[PDB]
Design a protein around this ligand. Sequence first.
Ligand SMILES: Nc1ncnc2c1ncn2[C@@H]1O[C@H](COP(=O)(O)OP(=O)(O)O)[C@@H](O)[C@H]1O
Ligand SMILES: Nc1ncnc2c1ncn2[C@@H]1O[C@H](COP(=O)(O)OP(=O)(O)O)[C@@H](O)[C@H]1O
Ligand SMILES: Nc1ncnc2c1ncn2[C@@H]1O[C@H](COP(=O)(O)OP(=O)(O)O)[C@@H](O)[C@H]1O
Ligand SMILES: Nc1ncnc2c1ncn2[C@@H]1O[C@H](COP(=O)(O)OP(=O)(O)O)[C@@H](O)[C@H]1O
Ligand SMILES: Nc1ncnc2c1ncn2[C@@H]1O[C@H](COP(=O)(O)OP(=O)(O)O)[C@@H](O)[C@H]1O
Ligand code: BEF
Ligand code: BEF
Ligand code: BEF
Ligand code: BEF
Ligand code: BEF
Ligand SMILES: [Mg+2]
Ligand SMILES: [Mg+2]
Ligand SMILES: [Mg+2]
Ligand SMILES: [Mg+2]
Ligand SMILES: [Mg+2]
Lengths: 366, 366, 366, 366, 366
Amino acid sequence: TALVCDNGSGLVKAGFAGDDAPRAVFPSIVGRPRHQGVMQKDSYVGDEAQSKRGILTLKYPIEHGIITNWDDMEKIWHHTFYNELRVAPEEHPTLLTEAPLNPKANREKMTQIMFETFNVPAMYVAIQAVLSLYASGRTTGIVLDSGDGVTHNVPIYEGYALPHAIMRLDLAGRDLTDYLMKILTERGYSFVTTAEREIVRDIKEKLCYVALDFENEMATAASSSSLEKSYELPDGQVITIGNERFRCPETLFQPSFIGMESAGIHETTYNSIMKCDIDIRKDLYANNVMSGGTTMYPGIADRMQKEITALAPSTMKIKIIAPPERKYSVWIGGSILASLSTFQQMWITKQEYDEAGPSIVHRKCF
Amino acid sequence: TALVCDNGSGLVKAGFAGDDAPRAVFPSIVGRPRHQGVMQKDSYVGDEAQSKRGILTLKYPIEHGIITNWDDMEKIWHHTFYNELRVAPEEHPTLLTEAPLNPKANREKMTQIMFETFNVPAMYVAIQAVLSLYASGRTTGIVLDSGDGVTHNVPIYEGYALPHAIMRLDLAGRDLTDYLMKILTERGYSFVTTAEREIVRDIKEKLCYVALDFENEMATAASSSSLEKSYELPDGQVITIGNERFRCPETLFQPSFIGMESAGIHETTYNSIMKCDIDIRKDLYANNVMSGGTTMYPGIADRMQKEITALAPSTMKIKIIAPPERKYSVWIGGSILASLSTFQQMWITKQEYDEAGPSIVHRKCF
Amino acid sequence: TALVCDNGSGLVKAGFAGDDAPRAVFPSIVGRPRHQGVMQKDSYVGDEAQSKRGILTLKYPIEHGIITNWDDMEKIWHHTFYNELRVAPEEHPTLLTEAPLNPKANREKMTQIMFETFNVPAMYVAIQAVLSLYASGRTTGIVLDSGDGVTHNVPIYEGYALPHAIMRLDLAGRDLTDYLMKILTERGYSFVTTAEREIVRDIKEKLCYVALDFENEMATAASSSSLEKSYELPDGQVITIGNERFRCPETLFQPSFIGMESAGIHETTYNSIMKCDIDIRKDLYANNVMSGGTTMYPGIADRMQKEITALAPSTMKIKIIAPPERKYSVWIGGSILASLSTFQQMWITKQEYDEAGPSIVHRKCF
Amino acid sequence: TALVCDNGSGLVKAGFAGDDAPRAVFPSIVGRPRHQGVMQKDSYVGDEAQSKRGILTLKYPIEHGIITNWDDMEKIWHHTFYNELRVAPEEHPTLLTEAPLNPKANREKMTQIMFETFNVPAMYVAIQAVLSLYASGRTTGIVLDSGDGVTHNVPIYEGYALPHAIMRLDLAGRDLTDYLMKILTERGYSFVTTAEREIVRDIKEKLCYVALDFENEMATAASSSSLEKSYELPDGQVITIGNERFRCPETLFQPSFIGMESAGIHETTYNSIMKCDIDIRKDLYANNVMSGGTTMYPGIADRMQKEITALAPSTMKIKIIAPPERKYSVWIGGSILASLSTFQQMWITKQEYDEAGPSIVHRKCF
Amino acid sequence: TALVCDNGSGLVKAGFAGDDAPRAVFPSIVGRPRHQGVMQKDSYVGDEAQSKRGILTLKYPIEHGIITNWDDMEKIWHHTFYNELRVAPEEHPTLLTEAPLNPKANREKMTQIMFETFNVPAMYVAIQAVLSLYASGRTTGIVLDSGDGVTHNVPIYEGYALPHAIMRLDLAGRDLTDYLMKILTERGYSFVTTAEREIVRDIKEKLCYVALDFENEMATAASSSSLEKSYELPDGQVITIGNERFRCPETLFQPSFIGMESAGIHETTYNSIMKCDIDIRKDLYANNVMSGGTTMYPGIADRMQKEITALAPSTMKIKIIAPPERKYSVWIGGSILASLSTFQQMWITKQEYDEAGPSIVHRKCF
Ligand SMILES: Nc1ncnc2c1ncn2[C@@H]1O[C@H](COP(=O)(O)OP(=O)(O)O)[C@@H](O)[C@H]1O
Ligand SMILES: Nc1ncnc2c1ncn2[C@@H]1O[C@H](COP(=O)(O)OP(=O)(O)O)[C@@H](O)[C@H]1O
Ligand SMILES: Nc1ncnc2c1ncn2[C@@H]1O[C@H](COP(=O)(O)OP(=O)(O)O)[C@@H](O)[C@H]1O
Ligand SMILES: Nc1ncnc2c1ncn2[C@@H]1O[C@H](COP(=O)(O)OP(=O)(O)O)[C@@H](O)[C@H]1O
Ligand SMILES: Nc1ncnc2c1ncn2[C@@H]1O[C@H](COP(=O)(O)OP(=O)(O)O)[C@@H](O)[C@H]1O
Ligand code: BEF
Ligand code: BEF
Ligand code: BEF
Ligand code: BEF
Ligand code: BEF
Ligand SMILES: [Mg+2]
Ligand SMILES: [Mg+2]
Ligand SMILES: [Mg+2]
Ligand SMILES: [Mg+2]
Ligand SMILES: [Mg+2]
């Protein structure tokens, strides 16, 4: 059986091809002690680093889909194979994922590590948005995947990708967390350390939602208090947040909140459709597929429906497809792809890698 | 029973001899993917290529009645026999059509393919304008056939053709479509790709008409807006066109609009009549038969009537015969001819082709 | 004296008729602050917007030769007359330029602004490729003008234009800049904002060249490092690019690199010649005139020479005329035309415009 | 004339707009007797509390730029207006200051007290780092202000602020004083009470300096005794300190000395520049403006110059601007701003406050 | 086997590593005759000085954890090795203890005496609060150790110490004894000499307790006499004390009783927890470990539980761990540490001390 590992900027999703859900889902963090030991491990990975985060400095080795710390990324892969899956890497072909429009050296160095450090028999690097379309059981649609580091649009029609219409935005979940940390100081709550950033991320996942009409929601939160909710910190302190609940996800539709010049995810989706041939736009309008953890905000599908309907012609039928399991769509699609009998010819074996060099990994890639 | 296949520059009309209408009518196009497949057929033909045209490059293998791409033309014949008619070619004699004054190698290579690739028992290549006269139930008349690639005049008197009065013009429907694409840029509408050319062709067939008086119509369209009509694009966008509706078909009467030096179809018809013997001109004036898709514009028979009346003597009775089914006149006439008991001696059998070479196909031909 | 203003998609070229070079050459941009002022002008134009681009959102009011933002285009004309030329518009007749096959409303609204906002005494809108032939001192030749927004071919023979052989391609310098931004992400360089697009444009103008043989050049850049060059960013960072230097201009000859279906500039030039009368093709083959900033790549004349020689008959003499000042050929030709005594009758005066309406501006136009 | 009051965490700087220096500079402390009176005022403020600190418990009402004790903060404002300036608050508009990223209720409650307790005619709360740029006579630069409670970086370019690049660190002078108290116990000196903390603060301001190379300085202080200096306590005891002189200010560059996870002021300045647009970084590198009392250590400008030069590209010109009067830069800039004729429209009058509520005070604020 | 010597300000605890209790526990006093001998030893140490205290002046060589009289401290170490343990110092490695935040010269001079006067083979100076956590069998908790001279809080999480949250208070048992001597004069009991201070210390250890509610206890002692207890002096006189029983230990929670400005041990514990990372506070709240003789008052754990519960959030579980043997926790923990096989590498041998100087003793120290 094959291994399917979706190495996100925020979460590692790993498991075996053929399963319906990832077996191991843990944060993609490496923690190191920042104080002084007197009574000890040198570094902690994943959920272990999360439970000891009070005395650790937490580091993400992947920033915006790009692996920045290769020594820490190797610890995460080692932790995934031996501690989470309890499997031998040299026995299973490994399907990895990557964001589109990544640097070419990122995929080449990832292939060298899988072949020379873990000695996998074969491997393959897929494009994440293509796997998301496999998970939804579709051959046509424009995928909006938004994770912790990358937001990208990839239109696909009848199984053919349109690489020249691919959009990529370096605004995702981690940028929303940093923005929530900033606007929480308006109420006197100060989250500074990397461990406290994990607390704000948990606040974001529990209380934040997307307002259908932002300016109408801002007036409601300013008049009454029915939108305010409480949250208990790990030390028992209770904080209360009001309009911060929908101001944080609003950055997805107004990236100028964090000083970015780019357009929101609704305009980016519409611009990607308008770059496609006029004869496929009707099918793309009816098959907007959302995937990734950042699409899990309550009300984001209704907001995307409203914003794209206002941009598209009135006779087009806009349909946002947001299944409940879309947070793992990339992994689920990779599990379906790695189980296809037609796919078994696309594995890049160790023998082919020794005779073709690193350039063999850049095929069917964009 | 015999097969009747009218392979036009734009449409394939195929069916069985004895029927009243073609069984299979589909565009004579071959489409190939122009992007990149990630999730597939290599090429699509006819209506299948039309429905997937958003991700295809569309190619017409026939240009101006002349087969240019023989590999693609073979795919269209294969698609016609096995996908559209669901018939075995080696069981039916096949009546094919051709425009007059075509290159001799076009008919010879078409005969070699029918005998050696499809192994038809017998075949025959008829002249299209002669079949149009069969469809109208006439033995005398001058036929003006205008399709997608060729416009030609053929006078026939009491069953005798006058080959030396045959006119041929390489201005037809596809040239009007390209001209409509050009003058639509005046309103800011940009159709460039081969898939968008199919959209303009649909605009032409829905909204374009022939003005009875062109300069009087240009003044009306410049003064008011009663001639403007809207059209909804496949993606929901609505375009509005005014004088482009009658400027496009006006090219048939003023070929200088597209830079051609030739005379319009009315002058070409009159010149063909004036090259005929003076004793048959009265019968030709009263039997102007129009056929083909490009004669389907509203008001073209009234315009032809007016233009030829102004050229002919005042005592001649000009009569334009334009039946409602004239878009399939060539096929209907070929269905009548292939069902005649007198015609059964004109079949070129496979045995006669092996003993006489390709030169046997050039009999009763011009 | 007359004003000659070449309003390109990328650069404004303005000056006085009779001069040898434009007096004012500045980018056709309008910048507006995108942050928040605390210590201010509302908008900046041209070189002023270029020097402050770090805190501005830069907007081009002309896209593909078509004016899209008329309020911003009016700011550019105002900046041209009063800040760059320091002249009174109501004292000089103004010769403007336009790309062929533009929407008719573009030229009409441009005439209304010049007569009612700036109150010019007279004006005239010339066709750019015709002016390029004036600059080269020729009466016969096929002009390939490629600027920031439009690439077009216009054949002219003995002073007569052939409008039905005019080609227009919406692929020019700005599309090459966007493609260079895309393929620079392969090396981990991320240019996203409109200000960073100006940096990539500067990279393109300094380092990009046209390879004589593309596939042979790709093998050289993949084997060694002699083609790699460094470039210092405004903040002191040094980037290094290799095959991106010739992959970006290769899009001119292979528009499928950016997903366009059209043919390259060499095939478009050859197709335009083949649409012309056979008796003028020999003179067009020997007078290929290149103009515009996008024809300034090193090696593009040698590549065009090689590609057209491979398409034309072996006995034809292909000659590419590429003078060193061809980046301003449209302006230089407009300066020659506006100084001709024969041209002084073609000025459209304010009095003629009030009595003939906007339709007077569509004369000698295509 | 207007009042300019810079209420710092450590010092109150108050005076009149138009002057060159604050008229009243006193510690922002409230002292209350902690023993028992037998022979009396209930509380002492400022320099009076400083001279009687032996029998007082000293309290700072402002912690890390945030007013914590509003009853004590009201005593300080009352002491400022009536005892230090000898002025009537209801006759002068008052310009107050605040650190960026403060809680919103801090500025709202400060406005309510100025309007309802002191009945000022108008008021305005400025951002401190913006005023520091006014004092230096610049429109572009990144300000590093470090006082007693807050250290913050604010980049400004051509008069436009970049709020999304603003850094704030809760490490300043009071944290260095507490760290000096801790490391003085290594030599057997025990400072515990709030009155003795004022003695350590005086030691810090007299003897502490920033080492150019910390590890090289630690080796010199460990080998000889040329770095040791003596200090006479208020009771005549003489203490001698060696490497504590530069270990205390080193916390600014290594916040891990006091257990903070954040980066030093040099890395924070460089990170703030790298978050800004690439086109403004060159101007920010050349205009590093330092302000506040914590930037008054000898050798801190040379150390900042060295640390940022090691982080920035080698071709950038790093220039630290540290004027001798930078300890009062916020007040001096507020004195310049309150004297501008353009600023007289930004006063928030008492009438506007009664009709717009407390929300009017959050304009041009971050 | 190793020697474990806990040299407190009040008691010497000495024994061998591996044992469960100290073998020698005696007061850390040196007594010298203060009258005139007529019928004799020059000085007495420990229990011998205690039994002859009537004719001696008693001196403590350690004040507030700091060795003040080095000649007398050497007599105590000599008495410990040769009279109490009857052991040869040059045969056993010696584990010594020290309070945190002590002067550096205290530990250096103690190391020089152990190596040059007693010629121990190896030695090590541990931090007392860390040893207290070893004794309780915990890896996480905040230790409140209160002896005769020093009270300090040290939080430890999962074996990692947080030195920047360490509190130290120079208020312990000897200050409570001096306060009891003062308030006993209210009943006419006069204890003045150093020998009578030992009697008051015995009164404190027998009769003093911590009141759960101080003001409610003061009302009970003022209304009735059920809280009064008698104590027989060495000469047969019987004294009776009432509210002095709980007023003396109340100084631990209200240090202002003896004129100290610091906060009580409950506020100091809570402040130390609040300086720690928010993610470890829940574990520190549940693991408050008390050690030392001054934590042996009846009712001090219930009072600490009540005071910290009133400061902490209501959802936190406050748990005070006070084992019955906590008066020797530092020694018991040092006996466990010196018996660990992992610790045998941390011994500072005499050879390492001769080659590294006194600076080797400051490792893993704060
Ligand atoms: N219920 C939720 N609501 C909002 N955001 C969520 C939710 N669950 C997860 N996220 C966000 O999704 C991001 C990561 O999701 P994922 O798609 O796994 O990203 P990646 O694949 O890049 O690691 C995190 O930043 C997290 O904050
Ligand atoms: N209703 C219509 N009005 C105008 N043109 C039409 C109409 N229907 C078909 N056509 C044109 O007729 C042309 C093809 O007709 P046809 O006679 O089948 O040509 P061919 O036989 O050469 O394929 C096409 O170019 C199409 O645009
Ligand atoms: N040396 C050069 N090499 C390549 N491209 C260039 C060079 N100089 C200018 N260009 C390109 O030419 C384009 C604009 O030239 P121009 O002919 O003025 O266009 P327009 O007239 O449409 O404004 C710009 O996109 C610019 O990038
Ligand atoms: N010469 C000096 N050297 C070092 N630190 C100084 C000096 N003078 C003042 N300080 C420190 O500056 C801090 C306060 O300066 P200031 O900028 O007024 O802060 P705030 O505005 O927050 O009150 C105090 O903590 C003080 O210790
Ligand atoms: N039962 C008790 N109740 C109250 N205090 C006690 C009791 N037993 C001992 N003490 C006090 O504990 C102090 C010394 O204990 P210890 O922890 O050994 O201190 P050190 O280690 O500093 O010598 C003495 O001041 C003594 O008065
Ligand atoms: F890396 Be995640 F998918 F943004
Ligand atoms: F080929 Be069609 F009949 F013009
Ligand atoms: F507008 Be440029 F001439 F392409
Ligand atoms: F409050 Be100070 F300016 F740090
Ligand atoms: F010296 Be004791 F432990 F207070
Ligand atoms: Mg992902
Ligand atoms: Mg036909
Ligand atoms: Mg141009
Ligand atoms: Mg300040
Ligand atoms: Mg002790």
